[PDB]
Amino acid sequence: VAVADESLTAFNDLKLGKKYKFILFGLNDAKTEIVVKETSTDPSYDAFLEKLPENDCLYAIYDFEYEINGNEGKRSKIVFFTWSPDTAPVRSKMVYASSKDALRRALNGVSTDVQGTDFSEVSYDSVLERVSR
C-alpha cells in the first residue's frame, strides 16, 4: 500500500533523534496506507510487549540498545518486527504479509528483522540473541 508520510518522519526522528524508543505501525481503516498507531519513549521492554495485539498484526520498530562488551559501552540497533500472531485472522495475516515490503523498503537504517508469530519469539532474550550474535 502507500507508506504515510507521518510514518517516515517518525522513523527519522527515532533514527537521527532518538525521539522514541519504539513505534507501532499498522494499516489505516481504508487499508490504503501504513500509519503510525503508537509511539513511546518508555525504555522498559515489557511496556513494548504489553502493546502487541494478542489476536492482530502490526509492524514495529524498536531501538534496541545492548552492551557490546570489552568494557566498551553500548551499541544500538534498529529492529523491524513483523507481528502476525498465530491467532490473527487469515485475512489480517494476508494483507500484512503483502504490505510489509512497502514499509520495510522505505526504512533505511534497519539492522535486524524479526518475524513474530508468538510471544516467546519476541521476548527480550530472543531479540537480544538476535542483535548480539
Asked if residues 83 and 115 have their Cβ atoms less than 8 Å apart, the reply is no
Sign, CA torsion 11/12/13/15: positive
Sign, CA torsion 9/47/88/29: negative
In angstroms, the CA 83 to CA 118 distance is 8
- The CA-atom distances, in angstroms, between 103 and each of 58, 87, 88, 100, 127 are 12, 23, 20, 6, 21
Method: X-ray
Instruction: Kindly list the structural domains of the chain, giving each domain's residue range(s) and its CATH number in brackets, ordered by start.
Output: 1-133 (3.40.20.10)
3-class secondary-structure state, position 35: strand
Cell, residue 30: 481504508
